[PDB]
Amino acid sequence: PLEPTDQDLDVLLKNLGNLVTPMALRVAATLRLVDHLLAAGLTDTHPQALSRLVRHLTVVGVLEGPLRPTRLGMLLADGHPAQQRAWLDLNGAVSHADLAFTGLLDVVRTGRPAYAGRYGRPFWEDLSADVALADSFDALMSCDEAPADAYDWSAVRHVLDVGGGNGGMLAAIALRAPHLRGTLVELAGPAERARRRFADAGLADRVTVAEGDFFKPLPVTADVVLLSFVLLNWSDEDALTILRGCVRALEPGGRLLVLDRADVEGDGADRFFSTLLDLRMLTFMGGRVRTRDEVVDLAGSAGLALASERTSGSTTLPFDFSILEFTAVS
Amino acid sequence: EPTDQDLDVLLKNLGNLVTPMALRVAATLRLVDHLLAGDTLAGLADRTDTHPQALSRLVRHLTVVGVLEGGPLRPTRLGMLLADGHPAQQRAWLDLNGAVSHADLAFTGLLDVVRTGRPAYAGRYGRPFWEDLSADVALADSFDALMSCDEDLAYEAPADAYDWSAVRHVLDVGGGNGGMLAAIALRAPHLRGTLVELAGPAERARRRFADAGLADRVTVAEGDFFKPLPVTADVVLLSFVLLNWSDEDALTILRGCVRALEPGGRLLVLDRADVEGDGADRFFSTLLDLRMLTFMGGRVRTRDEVVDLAGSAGLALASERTSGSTTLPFDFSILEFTA
Numbered sequence: 001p002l003e004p005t006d007q008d009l010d011v012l013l014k015n016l017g018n019l020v021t022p023m024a025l026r027v028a029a030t031l032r033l034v035d036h037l038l039a040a041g042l043t044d045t046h047p048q049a050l051s052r053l054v055r056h057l058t059v060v061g062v063l064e065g066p067l068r069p070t071r072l073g074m075l076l077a078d079g080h081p082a083q084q085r086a087w088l089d090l091n092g093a094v095s096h097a098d099l100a101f102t103g104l105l106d107v108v109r110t111g112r113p114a115y116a117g118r119y120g121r122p123f124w125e126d127l128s129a130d131v132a133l134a135d136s137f138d139a140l141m142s143c144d145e146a147p148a149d150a151y152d153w154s155a156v157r158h159v160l161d162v163g164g165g166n167g168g169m170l171a172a173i174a175l176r177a178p179h180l181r182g183t184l185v186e187l188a189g190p191a192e193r194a195r196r197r198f199a200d201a202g203l204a205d206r207v208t209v210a211e212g213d214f215f216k217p218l219p220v221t222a223d224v225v226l227l228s229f230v231l232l233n234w235s236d237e238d239a240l241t242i243l244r245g246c247v248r249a250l251e252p253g254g255r256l257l258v259l260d261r262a263d264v265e266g267d268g269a270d271r272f273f274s275t276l277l278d279l280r281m282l283t284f285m286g287g288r289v290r291t292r293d294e295v296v297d298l299a300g301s302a303g304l305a306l307a308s309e310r311t312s313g314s315t316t317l318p319f320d321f322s323i324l325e326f327t328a329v330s
Numbered sequence: 331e332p333t334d335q336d337l338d339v340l341l342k343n344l345g346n347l348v349t350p351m352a353l354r355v356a357a358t359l360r361l362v363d364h365l366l367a368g369d370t371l372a373g374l375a376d377r378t379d380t381h382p383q384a385l386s387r388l389v390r391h392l393t394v395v396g397v398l399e400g401g402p403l404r405p406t407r408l409g410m411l412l413a414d415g416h417p418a419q420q421r422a423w424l425d426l427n428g429a430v431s432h433a434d435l436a437f438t439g440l441l442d443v444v445r446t447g448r449p450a451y452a453g454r455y456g457r458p459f460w461e462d463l464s465a466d467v468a469l470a471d472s473f474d475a476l477m478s479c480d481e482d483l484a485y486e487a488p489a490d491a492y493d494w495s496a497v498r499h500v501l502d503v504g505g506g507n508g509g510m511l512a513a514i515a516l517r518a519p520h521l522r523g524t525l526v527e528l529a530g531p532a533e534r535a536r537r538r539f540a541d542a543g544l545a546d547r548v549t550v551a552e553g554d555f556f557k558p559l560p561v562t563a564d565v566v567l568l569s570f571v572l573l574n575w576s577d578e579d580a581l582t583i584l585r586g587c588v589r590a591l592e593p594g595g596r597l598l599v600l601d602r603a604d605v606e607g608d609g610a611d612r613f614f615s616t617l618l619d620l621r622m623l624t625f626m627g628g629r630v631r632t633r634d635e636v637v638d639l640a641g642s643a644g645l646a647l648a649s650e651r652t653s654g655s656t657t658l659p660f661d662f663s664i665l666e667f668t669a
């Protein structure tokens with residue numbers, strides 16, 4: 001029988017089971033403490049309570065002092081590229097969603113998401129009704145592609161981007177390859193952002209917005225179909241529905257590109273972020289992060305065979321991902 | 331100038347809200363205990379009545395962070411902390427059916443706490459902490475059990491550190507289910523004892539003293555320590571009570587104990603009371619301080635702060651000694667006061 005050491009207990013108490021310190025980091029972010037300090041009178045907070053928070057933040061290595069952030073505390077500076085202050089801000093969509101993890105017990109007992117239980121509407125319904133949440137989710141997901149540079153667009157003519165958000169990805173591709181036509185299928189919230197983006201980029205004559213629902217048949221065919229960070233939002237059954245719609249819209253010899261986190265044994269990818277994202281998808285909306293082999297197996301159920309595979313990743317966060325290219329089997 | 335390791339620390343540790351909830355779900359489901367009695371994944375799911383694919387995704391996260399390995403699926407060395415018999419009792423403290431981890435979930439309201447100075451517990455659970463315990467019996471039971479666990483010998487600290495040969499009557503004010511008082515009584519067979527507590531702990535203490543052979547000299551009085559105390563005594567004990575309360579409420583309790591003190595009596599205060607010299611881990615000072623604030627509006631006080639508060643109630647410090655948990659990294663102080 002293994003015997004925990006004092007260091008194991010330390011790790012459990014200060015790190016793995018510590019719920020207080022992540023909330024203290026979020027409250028600090030939401031208070032812009034690091035920023036508002038690079039500027040009693042401190043925030044709209046109760047001063048003795050704020051001092052008690054800062055004592056904690058000092059001990060865990062965020063602040064020090066002449067009260068100053070540490071080298072680590074400079075991650076909550078609004079200027080830092082990794083944008084952790086916005087990620088942690090309690091008014092933003094991700095931190096707001098993170099609080100639903102206090103319902104993790106029912107999630108694990110049932111596999112059903114917790115988001116609506118804390119807040120009333122499902123995730124996407126909530127983003128559509130709450131402009132503030134939608135705006136912040138937009139800014140976290142769209143700061144700083146991949147397919148525009150990874151893929152040979154000279155042999156493509158029409159790209160259909162299924163659930164392509166505010167059209168950022170489709171715009172990068174279309175600016176890159178002036179000969180391309182494009183269609184974006186999205187819900188009304190993101191459909192309008194993308195409409196405005198395409199008109200601003202001088203793309204409206206060849207890149208169109210087809211507002212709709214990717215659980216219905218797609219309105220057009222194309223020789224490249226893009227699914228960028230869509231499948232991980234959905235259960236296996238829903239994800240198979242989406243993929244079959246995509247297959248139906250593929251033209252002869254067309255290709256389907258799935259951009260997603262798709263782990264391979266022995267790639268360099270940090271499995272912590274794999275599981276963190278996987279539990280977020282489970283808890284926020286009942287999705288699931290799938291490995292390379294699981295995506296390939298699900299795509300095979302939809303009549304697709306893997307043609308090629310490429311990797312990319314974030315330029316401000318420690319997160320690598322893949323682009324998987326599929327062809328129709330017959 | 332943040333390094334790459336800095337960002338790793340923020341994402342995996344300091345800002346990570348997911349892993350601590352996974353630990354609490356793991357403890358609640360007793361996963362490690364099920365693994366230690368015999369494993370497969372689907373068997374684990376049936377013994378825990380959980381969704382099989384969701385449990386597998388929880389276990390994969392637990393594997394990555396070092397609580398589980400295998401899958402044969404088994405606890406790591408660190409994961410053995412979640413075995414129900416481990417002396418530090420972290421499975422029970424993390425159990426979402428127990429009072430402490432239940433209250434921890436109110437930390438989602440920490441923003442309001444820093445804005446207003448008021449606790450978050452009622453904002454989540456409808457009524458404040460002590461109110462909720464008196465109305466929810468299973469919650470109240472789990473809390474008393476967490477406080478009274480005898481794996482940690484901290485409860486023997488007064489019995490071992492103090493000289494009881496001349497003491498005639500000890501009054502333990504808020505003494506839980508009586509563990510501390512029983513320890514003193516067993517070391518000083520001449521002594522008489524009185525315990526004042528809420529209805530739940532008071533009956534658990536009545537049972538303790540009966541089973542121990544102590545009922546003839548240690549009596550229990552269900553009471554409110556915001557109301558005059560029912561007996562006087564030459565030693566009064568206040569063990570980890572004051573930190574649950576605001577300065578105004580703590581002072582009312584202290585004044586109540588003063589009036590209970592017989593002439594030349596001693597008040598013993600056990601609490602966490604940091605001193606700038608000492609080497610006690612300020613992580614646990616601040617963590618417990620934010621829990622008292624968030625759960626009930628309490629405050630962890632330094633030694634100077636306790637001594638100042640006691641001086642307002644008419645008490646001067648006679649002596650001070652360090653003690654500590656024998657299972658957790660948690661030193662504390664025994665502060666002796668005289669009128």
Ligand SMILES: CC[C@]1(O)Cc2c(O)c3c(c(O)c2[C@@H](O[C@H]2C[C@H](N)[C@H](O)[C@H](C)O2)C1)C(=O)c1c(OC)cccc1C3=O
Pocket residue numbers: 094097140141142229233273274276277280284313314317318319321
């Ligand atoms: C695992 C740690 C992570 O850094 C944080 C994170 C994250 O918290 C979420 C999502 C993520 O993709 C990620 C990843 O971070 C990056 C990856 C993206 N490719 C993109 O580069 C952007 C910068 O976010 C990983 C989502 O994709 C997401 C979502 O998809 C529509 C819906 C709701 C919540 C999240 C959600 O909370």
Ligand SMILES: CC[C@]1(O)Cc2c(O)c3c(c(O)c2[C@@H](O[C@H]2C[C@H](N)[C@H](O)[C@H](C)O2)C1)C(=O)c1c(OC)cccc1C3=O
Pocket residue numbers: 430433477478482484485569570574614617618621625655658660
């Ligand atoms: C930080 C490490 C620690 O284990 C954590 C801890 C703690 O988290 C809490 C409480 C603690 O007392 C403690 C400390 O435990 C001490 C106090 C007792 N004499 C007890 O018998 C034990 C042997 O040592 C220390 C409470 O006492 C408490 C409470 O008291 C009424 C009400 C709500 C939450 C806590 C609460 O969360």
Ligand SMILES: Nc1ncnc2c1ncn2[C@@H]1O[C@H](CSCC[C@H](N)C(=O)O)[C@@H](O)[C@H]1O
Pocket residue numbers: 124141162163164165166169185186187190212213214215227228229230233
């Ligand atoms: N039934 C549905 N039909 C079409 N789009 C949907 C949808 N349900 C969710 N979505 C869209 O799915 C998207 C997932 S996230 C946006 C990912 C985007 N392609 C990118 O890489 O940046 C959201 O924009 C959401 O509006």
Ligand SMILES: Nc1ncnc2c1ncn2[C@@H]1O[C@H](CSCC[C@H](N)C(=O)O)[C@@H](O)[C@H]1O
Pocket residue numbers: 460477478503504505506507510526527528531553554555556568569570571574
């Ligand atoms: N109004 C009140 N009157 C009497 N006891 C109270 C009380 N409010 C809270 N308490 C008791 O205060 C105690 C604080 S925690 C238990 C501390 C105990 N002396 C020990 O060292 O183990 C709890 O047992 C709780 O029941």
